[PDB]
């Protein structure tokens, strides 16, 4: 009947509970059968049956409000979400997606498709500010959980909601993609701090696809071309290799077929 569901709450959130969540998500996003340079590859979009296409991440807070997010298992990205009797979807880029998302939350009373997409550029201009000016951590997650919930009742406005998306995507999608960003959130969560992300986190987000390509295109682990990146102090450094990334990126989109038996 329903796609797989992962449960998480911000109530009593520890570093432990957060990490065992993000791990459980990763468990559902990939089998782990496709692993290249030690890194799990996301299932290939082409030929993928609609019934394996999405996963469900349910989020609740101390107020006991809950929302369920839909993640595409091919890009590990949020395509929409449900709160109570209403379901909301980001504007599809093509016919094929538009079809796919009709297999989600089919029992919901009301179904809305946004006139806008869920890409960062779009969300930033709606919420009124950049990812860098938007804070993260257990507290900003609790508020976003609520704002998404009360949107269906008219309680939430657009910029506030947009910002709420930016937060959850990063804390969940981005967190699942990168063990590094998972660590950045662990930090925040552990001490109950809240802070906007640094240039390193942001650039990693912008670079996910390209890294995925280079890695699967690599020659015995060596890139054909480097990818620019920033550390926390916003200074650039170039990545010519794989072994650097293994501690960083947890999942990869599917660029091409796996490698030969050798390595």
């Amino acid at each position: 009947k329903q796609y797989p569901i992962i449960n998480f709450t911000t109530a009593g959130a520890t570093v432990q509970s957060y990490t065992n969540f993000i791990r459980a998500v990763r468990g559902r996003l990939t089998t782990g059968a496709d692993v290249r340079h030690e890194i799990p590859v996301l299932p290939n979009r082409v030929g993928l049956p609609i019934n394996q296409r999405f996963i469900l991440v349910e989020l609740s807070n101390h107020a006991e409000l809950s929302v369920t997010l839909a993640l595409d298992v091919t890009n590990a990205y949020v395509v929409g979400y449900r709160a109570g009797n209403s379901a909301y979807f980001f504007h599809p880029d093509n016919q094929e997606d538009a079809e796919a998302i009709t297999h989600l939350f089919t029992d919901v009373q009301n179904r809305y498709t946004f006139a806008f997409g869920g890409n960062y550029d779009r969300l930033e201009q709606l919420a009124g500010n950049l990812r860098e000016n938007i804070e993260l951590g257990n507290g900003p997650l609790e508020e976003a959980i609520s704002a998404l919930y009360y949107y269906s009742t008219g309680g939430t406005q657009l910029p506030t909601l947009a910002r709420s998306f930016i937060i959850c995507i990063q804390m969940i999608s981005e967190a699942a993609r990168f063990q590094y960003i998972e660590g950045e959130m662990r930090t925040r969560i552990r001490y109950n701090r809240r802070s906007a992300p640094d240039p390193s986190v942001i650039t990693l987000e912008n670079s996910w696809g390209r890294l995925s390509t280079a890695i699967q295109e690599s020659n015995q682990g060596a890139f054909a071309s480097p990818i620019q990146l920033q550390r926390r102090n916003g200074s650039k450094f170039s990545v010519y290799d794989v072994s650097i990334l293994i501690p960083i990126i947890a999942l990869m989109v599917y660029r091409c077929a796996p490698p030969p038996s050798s390595q």
Partner: nanobody
Amino acid sequence: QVQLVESGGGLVQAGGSLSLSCAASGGDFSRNAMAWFRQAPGKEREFVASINWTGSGTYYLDSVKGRFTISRDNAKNALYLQMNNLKPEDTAVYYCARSTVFAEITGLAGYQSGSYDYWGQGTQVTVSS
């Protein structure tokens, strides 16, 4: 600034035909969900037809089902309502309504006047005999 203007209204006889047009401007039309409603005096405002942002998914009030056809030209920034076998019941002021927030609205919400932020001035449809 978003604009909604309906034309094509008038008077016809039971069985007669009409072609309705809404001229929309401003905003991004090609990404906006759209519908037609109607209201007769003394009567509550009733849903008529809805159409998503792409060419096709569409819903009708069953009284009008098969008699009426809603369409849109996203290049022309235009919405259309075709009314063919016309009845005295169909007499009412017809309004076009836009949602700039939503590309598509289905399920219960699709019939609710509340879910659409922009409305047109309206055009009168009277049917005789």
